[PDB]
RNA sequence: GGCGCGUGGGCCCCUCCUGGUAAGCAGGACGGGCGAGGCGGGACGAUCCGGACGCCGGGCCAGGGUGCGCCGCCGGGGCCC
């Protein structure tokens, strides 16, 4: 890419863009804090109102999972190897985000005994991105330390700072694919297990954990 | 000139396998190549194997403990030419130069402010 | 360490069954993942509904009080190495969740049966006048007394830190 | 002295090593075994079409 | 350590990046055009540098008659060839044209000088039109070598190539049922 | 032994179906085929001329040749680590038209129709992309539940 | 696409088979391993359980264990030649 404008014009436009990004960041942070609080309160109110009327309130199903690889690379069957390659889980103790459909769920079930997964919270997502966040730019692994990089690479999808990225991941918005692939897979610290050989349901370790993924990973960030 | 601290990743030399049990086998390094060789497999008790990775930081590679770079000379002309960067390079007189030539070379070097590593040799 | 859960479940509505019947069960488990697993385990066998054809409407944790002591009767079936057997047991505890722990430990120690080898049929609270087992009965009476069953344990426990002592300690009783 | 007669143990792995090669994109349009009367008519119709005939002038 | 890198990934490829010839003229030209491309990103220059890196077997010669036939609708443009231009005696008369080549035969050079044409060097092309404005890039036929026509298996039913030596028998050389 | 005659191991795949013996219905002769059409291969064991090999039973291919009495069908066959294009001649009793594209054709027709409809009225165009089953949404259910218990052995 | 080397005695594990009373016997099949894979554990083993390797400092921890040899433990329930 070749730029025609002089150095001073670039400097001035860069400063203008930075100011715009800062303002957007402040506004979005306030808005999203309000949104999270409101979500929790509305769910509680729905539960109470339904309860008075001899009815059960069934909440929404999880839309995004957090899956982490817990088994190594020696002696792996071919189909499992392919599926794990397509999730970008090529090393032990790596982690990624994943949208939920029947297409993705069936593949996850096939690779079950190599991973553990569940539904994350906003706090987990924010900690992961702030402390272990790196960007894939032209095939390089670039650290994320400020909102300028996010704005430069993801502006065309209305993503201008860390708050928008967190919100897009949590809500599984219309730009989940680009935002998710913009992130390099997380390289976490070593994992504390109970028994790598068996499913979480029967006291083991692999498979579906639900909300306990949050503590399991909080130990690792 | 000031420089970084010199680190040597290994202090001892790499000795050839089994050279302590036979006089006919010299200690100079050779790569082990047997089908059953235990040093090729690198079992826990064997001696270390040569590899890239032991390499020195290239900022201080070839630097003598005094902090200079070595330059071997044998004539007074060789000294005068190619010693304008006297900051980092020191002179070493070759083995075969005689005592008269050594006297002349030392006088010239002292005039030019160039360091000589083997200045005391052949002085009895 | 068990909890007690109430789980609601239903088969997904179809075109010929717009509003399927709902089922409720009581489950004792160490967490809610295990609770839902056991719920589906029983629903598949008793009502021919698999996890894939149904949905779970609510898994609500319920905490008891735990002040006084009650007598619990537990009816169960377990599989051994030679088939299956029914069994009635009596336990004395402060909560029904604590009684299940005692029952599971006794089954593990005496019969060698693990969690997934046992099916709890019913758990009820029994009055002091209709106890069936002799140990619980002898502990339901009034003014019951006995000496300390293992006072050597206190002396043994203190010797781990004080290795060498100037006399052999006595065991007070 | 008898040796092995047969094994296919390693053959599927060797096949997938460089992928399974697809055929060329010209093998789908060859005239290798087409009906001659159809082929002759196709030749004459093209040659008499002014907009697609390669005859000079 | 401890990573899987051989599941959806292929082996690296090897391509030429330097001319490989001892001739200093070709090194100078390649470096100059690489600099020009670095500072402009133009496609003409990129293809030119790539062509200047090719080996001799991949740079067939071009005739004056072929050049004339290729400039029928573009007589005012400049023909650029990264090879030598030879003569064609079969052509009695040649038009007027501008050609830039690595080399010219003495006869081709003289024929072009007559008829009012102009023979240009890559140095002058760099001096005047570094980005190839009003220029056409041409090459010869890469499959014209006699070696190229003997690749394959002569004895198979579906090949259309001849054997390499001299053969005097009949077994397998007189139809599909000669074996 | 191990012999590999042309029709080895065909005891079940070439037999007629139960209560479906005898001559074929006449629809198998008066349906129309065109070049480039997808067809299925199913061997009929009552007709012994133009019969394909057992390998081609249950494969799909395209028509490359329309003949006076037989069709030419192209089929992809895997041989070791490679795919070969095989061209075979089949008589009409062993070939049926294939519905492997019907879903795509109907999708294209519906997409075009819906695109036309909303434009005339100006209504917004819906999403014309298939979706893999998404997770269920929030809702409220009523309780008239039946207590479920575990039976004795 | 061109040119070219080595190889053409294999063996073991999982699950599925055939001959044989059986065999650390002989013969086949999908996947993996040793061959050609260092390191920790299984007392001891080419293949088992983990983990697949440039030279170093720090942290976390898989598999397996925590009387003494020999780095590392306690608490609770039941049984007990
Ligand atoms: Mg295993
Ligand atoms: Mg050294
Ligand atoms: Mg053989
Ligand atoms: Mg041999
Ligand atoms: Mg054997
Ligand atoms: Mg060998
Ligand atoms: Mg290996
Ligand atoms: Mg110790
Ligand atoms: Na070992």
Q: Are C29 and C2 in contact (CB under 8 A)?
A: yes
- Is chain B in touch with chain A: ≥3 Cβ pairs within 8 A? no
CA distance A104 to A115: 14
Q: Which of C44, C94, C22 is nearest to C65 (CA)?
A: C94
**Alpha-carbon distances of B21 from A86, A138, B35, B41, B49, rounded to whole Å:** 55, 57, 20, 20, 19
Half-sphere exposure of A32 (CA within 13 A, CB side): 20
CA distance B14 to C94: 73
DSSP H or E run through F120 = helix F102-121
CA distance E130 to A126: 53
Partner C contacted by A36 (CB < 8 A)? no
Three-state SS for F141? strand
Q: Which two tokens stand for residue E11?
A: 């082996």
- Is chain B in touch with chain D: ≥3 Cβ pairs within 8 A? no
Q: Does C121 sit within 8 Å of F146, measured CB to CB?
A: no
Kindly report the nearest CA distance between residue D35 and chain F, in angstroms: 7
Radius of gyration (C-alpha) of chain C in whole angstroms: 22
Q: Which of B43, B47, B54, B40 is nearest to B19 (CA)?
A: B47
In this structure, what are the phi and psi dihedrals at residue C119, rounded to the nearest 5 degrees? -125, 120
Which listed ligand is nearest to D3 at the C-alpha? 3
Torsion E59-E60-E64-E66 (CA) sign: negative
Q: Are F36 and F43 in contact (CB under 8 A)?
A: no
Whether any strand G atom is under 7 angstroms from the Cβ of C102: the reply reads yes
CA distance C132 to C130: 6
Residue whose pair of structure tokens reads 């054709």 in the numeric block: F105
Q: Which of A93, A184, A195, A86 is nearest to E3 (CA)?
A: A93
Name all contacts of A131-138 with Cβ < 8 Å and 24+ positions apart: A131/A221, A132/A186, A132/A187, A132/A188, A132/A221, A133/A183, A134/A183, A134/A184, A135/A182, A135/A183, A135/A184, A136/A181, A136/A182, A136/A183, A136/A184
Q: Which 49-108 residues of chain A approach strand G with CB closer than 7 Å?
A: 71-78, 91-92
| Residue-wise DSSP of F39-106 | EEE---TT--SSPPPGGGTT-EEEEEEE-SSEEEEEEEEE-SSBEEEEEEEEEGGGEEE--SSHHHHH
Torsion A20-A21-A26-A28 (CA) sign: positive
Around Cβ A214, how many Cβ atoms within 10 Å? 16
CA distance F61 to F35: 12
Name all contacts of B13-16 with Cβ < 8 Å and 24+ positions apart: B14/B48, B14/B49, B14/B50, B15/B47
In this structure, what are the phi and psi dihedrals at residue A17, rounded to the nearest 5 degrees? -60, -40
Which listed ligand is nearest to B9 at the C-alpha? 2
Q: Which of A176, A170, A175 is nearest to A156 (CA)?
A: A175
Three-state SS for B70? strand
Q: With both helix axes pointing from N to C terminus, report the angle between A147-154 and A7-52 in degrees, rounded to the nearest 10.
A: 90
Longest dimension (CA), chain E: 72
| Residue-wise DSSP of D19-54 | --BPPPTTTTS--TT--HHHHHHHHHHHHH-TTT--
Whether any strand G atom is under 7 angstroms from the Cβ of D3: the reply reads yes
CA B9 / ligand 2 centre spacing (Å): 8
Q: Which of B112, B66, B119, B65 is nearest to B92 (CA)?
A: B119
Q: Are C119 and C144 in contact (CB under 8 A)?
A: no
Separation in Å: G58 C1' and E65 CA:
76
Q: Are B108 and B79 in contact (CB under 8 A)?
A: yes
Tell me whether strands E135-138 and E78-81 are parallel, antiparallel or unpaired.
Answer: parallel
CA distance F70 to B35: 64
CA distance E162 to E154: 5
Longest dimension (CA), chain F: 74
Around Cβ A62, how many Cβ atoms within 10 Å? 15
Whether any strand G atom is under 7 angstroms from the Cβ of A192: the reply reads yes
Tell me whether strands A140-143 and A186-187 are parallel, antiparallel or unpaired.
Answer: unpaired
Q: With both helix axes pointing from N to C terminus, report the angle between A122-132 and A162-171 in degrees, rounded to the nearest 10.
A: 140
Residue nearest to nucleotide G9 (CA to C1'): D3
Partner A contacted by C41 (CB < 8 A)? no
CA distance C106 to C90: 11
Q: Number of residue pairs across A and C with CB atoms under 8 Å?
A: 17
Three-state SS for C91? strand
Residue to mutate among C121, C123, C124, with most F CBs inside 10 A, is: C121
Three-state SS for B99? helix
What residues 105-144 of chain F have any CB closer than 8 A to a CB of chain C?
Answer: 136, 141-144
Q: Which two tokens stand for residue F80?
A: 């070791």
Sequence-separated (6 or more) residues with CB below 8 Å from residue A140: none
CA distance F127 to F130: 8
Distance in angstroms between the alpha carbons of the first and the last residue of chain F: 54
Q: Which of C26, C22, C27, C18 is nearest to C55 (CA)?
A: C22
Strand partners, C120: C76
Separation in Å: G22 C1' and D8 CA:
29
Q: Are C132 and C73 in contact (CB under 8 A)?
A: yes
Residues after which chain A is broken (C–N above 2.5 A) are none
Q: Does A60 sit within 8 Å of F142, measured CB to CB?
A: no
Around Cβ A197, how many Cβ atoms within 10 Å? 11
- DSSP letter (8 states) at residue C149: S
Q: Are F106 and C22 in contact (CB under 8 A)?
A: no
Residue nearest to nucleotide G78 (CA to C1'): C109
Name all contacts of B102-108 with Cβ < 8 Å and 24+ positions apart: B104/B76, B105/B73, B105/B75, B105/B76, B105/B79, B108/B76, B108/B79, B108/B80
Chain A partners within 8 Å of C116 (Cβ): 202
Residue nearest to nucleotide G31 (CA to C1'): A77
Q: Are E50 and E137 in contact (CB under 8 A)?
A: no
DSSP H or E run through D15 = helix D11-15
CA distance E149 to E154: 11
Tell me whether strands A134-137 and A94-99 are parallel, antiparallel or unpaired.
Answer: unpaired
CA distance E154 to E156: 6
CA distance F128 to F107: 9
Q: Which of E114, A80, C32, D23 is nearest to F83 (CA)?
A: D23
**Alpha-carbon distances of F8 from A158, F2, F48, F50, rounded to whole Å:** 66, 10, 15, 17
Q: Which of D20, D28, D33 sits opposite F83 (nearest CB)?
A: D20
Q: Residue F72 burial (CB < 10 Å; 0-12/13-18/19+)? A: buried
The secondary structure of C39-82, three-state, reads: HHHHHHHHHCCCCCCEEEEEEEEECCCCCCCEEEEEEEEEEECC
Longest dimension (CA), chain C: 86
DSSP H or E run through B90 = strand B89-93
Name all contacts of E54-58 with Cβ < 8 Å and 24+ positions apart: E54/E16, E54/E82, E55/E16, E55/E20, E57/E145, E58/E142
CA C128 / ligand 3 centre spacing (Å): 83
Kindly report the nearest CA distance between residue E50 and chain A, in angstroms: 21
Sequence-separated (6 or more) residues with CB below 8 Å from residue C9: C22, C23, C25, C39, C40, C43, C49, C54, C55, C56, C57
Q: Which of C122, C66, C59, C69 is nearest to C92 (CA)?
A: C69
**Alpha-carbon distances of C124 from B6, C7, C53, C92, C113, rounded to whole Å:** 79, 19, 32, 12, 22
Around Cβ C152, how many Cβ atoms within 10 Å? 9
A91 is in an annotated binding site: no
Three-state SS for F19? coil
Tell me whether strands E84-86 and E103-104 are parallel, antiparallel or unpaired.
Answer: parallel
Three-state SS for B103? helix
The secondary structure of A83-131, three-state, reads: HHHHCCCCECCEEEEEECCHHHHHHHHHCHHHEEEECCCHHHHHHHHHH
The order of strands in the sheet holding E103-104 is E62-63, E84-86, E103-104
Q: Which of F51, F47, F41 is nearest to F6 (CA)?
A: F51
Whether any strand G atom is under 7 angstroms from the Cβ of D8: the reply reads yes
Around Cβ E16, how many Cβ atoms within 10 Å? 11
CA distance A89 to A98: 11
Q: Does D14 sit within 8 Å of F81, measured CB to CB?
A: yes
Q: Which of C40, C39, C28 is nearest to C2 (CA)?
A: C28
CA distance C118 to C167: 51
Name all contacts of E32-38 with Cβ < 8 Å and 24+ positions apart: E32/E126, E33/E126, E36/E126, E36/E130, E36/E131
Kindly report the nearest CA distance between residue F144 and chain D, in angstroms: 58
Whether any strand G atom is under 7 angstroms from the Cβ of D4: the reply reads yes
Strand partners, C87: C76
Q: Which of E169, E178, E173 is nearest to E154 (CA)?
A: E173
CA distance B25 to B60: 34
Whether any strand G atom is under 7 angstroms from the Cβ of B54: the reply reads yes
Kindly report the nearest CA distance between residue D46 and chain F, in angstroms: 19
CA distance E93 to D56: 23
Q: Which of C57, C75, C85 sits opposite F141 (nearest CB)?
A: C57
Name all contacts of C97-103 with Cβ < 8 Å and 24+ positions apart: C97/C2, C97/C3, C97/C4, C97/C28, C97/C64, C98/C2, C98/C66, C99/C72, C99/C74, C99/C123, C100/C2, C100/C4, C100/C28, C100/C74, C101/C1, C101/C2, C103/C74, C103/C76
Residues in chain E: 179
DSSP H or E run through B92 = strand B89-93
Q: Which of F142, F145, F151 sits opposite C23 (nearest CB)?
A: F145
Three-state SS for C21? coil
Strand partners, C55: C10
- Is chain C in touch with chain B: ≥3 Cβ pairs within 8 A? no
Quick one: closest CA in E to A91, which residue? Answer: E3
- Residues on C contacting F at a C-beta cutoff of 8 Å: 8, 10, 19, 21-25, 42-43, 46-47, 55, 57, 75, 77, 84-86, 119-122
Q: Which two tokens stand for residue B35?
A: 């089908």
Q: Are A119 and A213 in contact (CB under 8 A)?
A: yes
- Header resolution in angstroms: 2.5
Q: Which of A56, A201, A208 sits opposite C57 (nearest CB)?
A: A56
Kindly report the nearest CA distance between residue F130 and chain A, in angstroms: 12
Whether any strand G atom is under 7 angstroms from the Cβ of D26: the reply reads no
Partner A contacted by F133 (CB < 8 A)? yes
CA distance A35 to A44: 14
Q: Does A72 sit within 8 Å of E7, measured CB to CB?
A: no
| Residue-wise DSSP of chain E | --B--SSS---------S---S-HHHHHHHHHHHHHHHTT--HHHHHHHHHHT--GGG---EEHHHHHHHTSS-TTSEEEESSEEE--TT-S-----EEE-SEE-HHHHHHHHGGG-EEE-HHHHHHH-TT-TTEEEE---TT--TTGGG-S-TTSTT-----SS-----TTSSSTT--
Q: Does E8 sit within 8 Å of A73, measured CB to CB?
A: no
CA distance F99 to F60: 10
Partner C contacted by F146 (CB < 8 A)? yes
What residues 100-119 of chain C have any CB closer than 8 A to a CB of chain A?
Answer: 116
Q: Which two tokens stand for residue A124?
A: 């987990």
Q: Which ranges of chain B would DSSP assign to H, the alpha helix?
A: 38-41, 76-80, 99-112
As residues whose CB is below 5 A from the ion ligand 3, the structure lists: D 3
CA distance C61 to C7: 9
Q: Residue A215 burial (CB < 10 Å; 0-12/13-18/19+)? A: exposed
| Residue-wise DSSP of chain A | ----S-HHHHHHHHHHHHHHHHHHHHHHHHHHHHHHHHHHHHHHHHHHHHHHTTEEEE-PPP-EEEEEE-S-SSS--HHHHHHHHHTT--BTTEEEEEE--HHHHHHHHHTGGGEEEEPPPHHHHHHHHHHH-EEEETTEEEE--SHHHHHHHHGGGT--SHHHHHHHHHHT-TTHHHHHHTBPPEEPPPPP-S-TTSBGGGTSSBEEEETTHHHHHHTT-
In this structure, what are the phi and psi dihedrals at residue A20, rounded to the nearest 5 degrees? -55, -45
Partner C contacted by A117 (CB < 8 A)? no
Protein-covered nucleotides on strand G (Cβ within 7 A): 1-3, 9-12, 26-33, 36-40, 49-56, 59-63, 74-79
Q: Does E41 sit within 8 Å of A90, measured CB to CB?
A: no
């Amino acid at each position: 890419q070749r730029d025609i404008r002089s150095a001073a014009e670039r400097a001035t436009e860069k400063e203008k863009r930075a100011a715009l990004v800062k303002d957007h960041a402040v506004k979005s942070a306030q808005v999203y804090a309000r949104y999270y609080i409101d979500l929790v309160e509305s769910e509680k109110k729905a539960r109470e109102n339904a309860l008075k009327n001899n009815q059960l309130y069934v909440p929404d199903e999880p839309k995004v999972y957090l899956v982490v690889r817990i088994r190594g690379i020696v002696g792996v069957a071919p189909k499992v190897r392919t599926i794990l390659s397509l999730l970008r889980l090529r090393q032990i103790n790596n982690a990624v985000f994943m949208r939920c459909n029947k297409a993705t769920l069936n593949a996850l079930r096939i690779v079950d005994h190599y991973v553990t997964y569940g539904e994350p919270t906003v706090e987990t997502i924010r900690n992961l991105i702030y402390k272990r966040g790196f960007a894939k730019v032209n095939g390089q692994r670039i650290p994320i330390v400020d909102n300028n990089l996010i704005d430069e690479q993801l502006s065309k999808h209305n993503i201008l700072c860390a708050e928008d990225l967190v919100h897009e991941i949590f809500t599984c918005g219309s730009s989940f694919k680009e935002a998710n692939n913009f992130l390099w897979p997380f390289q976490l610290n070593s994992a504390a297990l109970k028994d790598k050989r068996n499913n979480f349901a029967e006291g083991g370790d692999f498979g579906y954990r639900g909300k306990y993924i949050n503590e399991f990973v909080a130990r690792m960030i | 000139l000031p420089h970084k601290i010199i680190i040597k990743k290994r202090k001892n030399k790499f000795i050839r396998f089994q050279s302590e049990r036979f006089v006919r086998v010299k200690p100079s390094w050779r790569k082990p190549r047997g089908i059953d060789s235990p040093m090729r497999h690198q079992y826990r008790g064997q001696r270390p194997m040569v590899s890239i990775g032991y390499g020195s930081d290239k900022e201080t590679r070839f630097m003598l403990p005094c902090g200079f770079f070595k330059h071997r000379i044998s004539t007074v002309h060789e000294l005068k030419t190619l010693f304008m960067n006297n900051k980092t390079h020191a002179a070493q007189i070759a083995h075969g130069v005689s005592a008269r030539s050594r006297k002349q070379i030392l006088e010239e070097a002292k005039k030019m402010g160039v360091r000589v590593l083997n200045a005391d040799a052949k002085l009895r | 360490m068990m909890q007690k859960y109430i789980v609601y479940g239903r088969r997904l509505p179809s075109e010929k069954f717009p509003e399927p019947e709902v089922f409720r069960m009581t489950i004792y488990a160490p967490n809610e993942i295990v609770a839902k697993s056991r719920f589906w385990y029983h629903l598949k066998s008793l009502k021919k509904i698999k996890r894939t054809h149904g949905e779970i409407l609510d898994c609500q944790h319920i905490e008891e009080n735990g002040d006084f002591v009650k007598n619990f009767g537990v009816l169960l079936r377990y599989r051994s190495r030679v088939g299956q057997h029914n069994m009635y047991r009596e336990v004395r505890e402060t909560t029904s969740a604590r009684a299940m722990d005692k029952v599971y430990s006794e089954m593990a120690g005496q019969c060698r049966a693990r969690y997934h080898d046992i099916q709890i049929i019913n758990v009820k609270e029994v009055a002091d006048e209709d106890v069936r087992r002799e140990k619980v009965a002898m502990f339901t009476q009034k003014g019951v007394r006995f000496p300390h069953p293992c006072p050597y344990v206190h002396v043994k426990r203190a010797a781990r830190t004080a290795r060498f002592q100037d006399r052999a300690p006595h065991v007070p009783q | 002295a008898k040796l092995k007669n047969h094994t296919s143990k390693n053959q599927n792995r060797k096949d997938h090593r460089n992928g399974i090669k697809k055929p060329k994109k010209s093998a789908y349009t060859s005239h290798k075994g087409m009906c001659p009367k159809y082929l002759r008519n196709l030749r004459r119709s093209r040659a008499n079409d002014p907009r697609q005939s390669l005859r000079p002038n | 350590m401890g990573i899987d890198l051989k599941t959806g990934i292929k082996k690296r490829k090897v391509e030429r990046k330097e001319p490989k010839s001892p001739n200093p003229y070709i090194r100078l030209l390649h470096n100059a055009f690489k600099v020009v491309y670095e500072n402009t990103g133009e496609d003409f220059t990129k293809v030119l540098t790539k062509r200047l890196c090719l080996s001799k077997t991949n740079r067939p010669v071009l005739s004056v008659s072929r050049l004339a036939h290729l400039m029928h609708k573009r007589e005012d443009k400049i023909a650029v060839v990264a090879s030598t231009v030879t003569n064609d005696e079969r052509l009695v008369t040649i038009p007027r044209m501008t050609i830039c080549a690595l080399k010219f035969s003495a006869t081709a050079r003289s024929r072009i000088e007559k008829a009012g044409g102009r023979c240009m060097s890559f140095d002058e092309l760099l001096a005047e039109k570094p980005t190839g404005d009003n220029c056409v890039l041409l090459q010869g036929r890469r499959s014209c070598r006699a070696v190229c026509k003997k690749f394959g298996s002569p004895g198979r039913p579906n090949s259309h190539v001849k054997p390499k030596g001299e053969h005097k028998g009949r077994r397998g050389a007189r139809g599909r049922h000669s074996w | 032994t191990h012999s590999q005659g042309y029709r080895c191991k065909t005891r079940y795949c070439f037999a007629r179906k139960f209560r479906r013996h005898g001559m074929a219905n006449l629809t198998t002769y008066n349906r129309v085929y065109k070049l480039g059409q997808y067809v299925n291969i199913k061997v009929n064991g009552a007709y012994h001329k133009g019969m394909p090999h057992r390998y081609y039973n249950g494969r799909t291919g395209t028509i490359f040749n329309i003949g006076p009495r037989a069709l030419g069908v192209q089929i992809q066959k895997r041989v070791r680590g490679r795919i070969m294009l095989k061209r075979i001649n089949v008589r009409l009793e062993h070939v049926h038209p294939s519905d492997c594209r019907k879903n795509h054709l109907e999708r294209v027709a519906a997409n075009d129709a819906a695109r036309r409809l909303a434009k005339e009225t100006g209504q917004p165009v819906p999403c014309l992309k298939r979706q893999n089953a998404l997770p269920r949404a929030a809702h409220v259910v009523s309780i008239a539940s039946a207590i479920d218990i575990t039976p004795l052995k």
